[model samples]
Target: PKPGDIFEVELAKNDNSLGISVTGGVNTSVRHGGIYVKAVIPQGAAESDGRIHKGDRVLAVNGVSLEGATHKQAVETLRNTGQVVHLLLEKGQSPT
Candidate 1:
């Protein structure tokens, strides 16, 4: 059984960006869950790292938990971080 399968990603800044976007959080537009990977820059930090994927729910960023964070708070944490941001994730869907 797939119990608690999880992983992490390291996205470095290029041109001052992490090249990723997310949507939904604890209580906003939550259809199934909050916080999912919306997009990854084709050849940027997230993409080049090759671990991140769409439908992957973000669990944390740079040690800051997103467990019950708001959409605004989650977005801000991802967008505002250090030279290299650490992304903790859990797959939210089957491979597409």
Candidate 2:
């Protein structure tokens, strides 16, 4: 999915289901899966997205790159703050 796209996620277990939605965090300098780029952005918004905990690296978007995000790009994406951004996250404990 490209920038401005909306993503929805759902989980099911024992007849229980839950889900959420959010806007795509896309912008220049954002890291791709492996390719190298010169720009980067700090993704504080991603951390605050609620879907992903702090310290969780954005691995991908709708099955896209997440390995090589620059600090600037990430920040630009996160600039769209307050928007309901949906994402698949790596589950783990995060530092408070």
Candidate 3:
């Protein structure tokens, strides 16, 4: 849908055994950048899925776009979603 890095992930209750960590904020360098995937817990839903990775930028949840959503808003949406949560993500930068 929108530009930038894009990925779609479906998360179930079991898939999210461990919470997903994210970064980027309104007052930070990520002001205009969307919420980013900071880290995926080991053996957690994200890690188990193998599609998610550290540094991935979250683009949306389900079908709703998070292009302009604040970090708090994005977290709220993900927390309220059902067992099956769809995530739109963009791959982050590579470690040198």
Task: Write down the TM-score of every candidate.
Answer: 0.71, 0.31, 0.71
lDDT of 2 by residue, 2-94 (tens): 333333322221232112222222333222321121222233332233344333344443444445555444433333223334333343222
Question: What does candidate 2 score on TM?
Answer: 0.31
Clash totals for all models, in order? 0, 15, 3
The clash tally of candidate 1 reads 0
On the 0 to 100 scale, the lDDT of residue 88 in model 1 is 82
Task: State the weakest 10-residue window (summed lDDT) of model 3.
Answer: 24-33
Better of 1 and 2 by TM-score: 1
Q: Which residues of candidate 3, in runs, are more than 4 Å off?
A: 1-5, 13-18, 25-27, 31-33, 94-96
Q: Model 1 RMSD to the real structure?
A: 3.2
lDDT of each: 0.67, 0.33, 0.64
Off by over 4 Å in 1: 1-3, 14-16, 26-33, 94-96
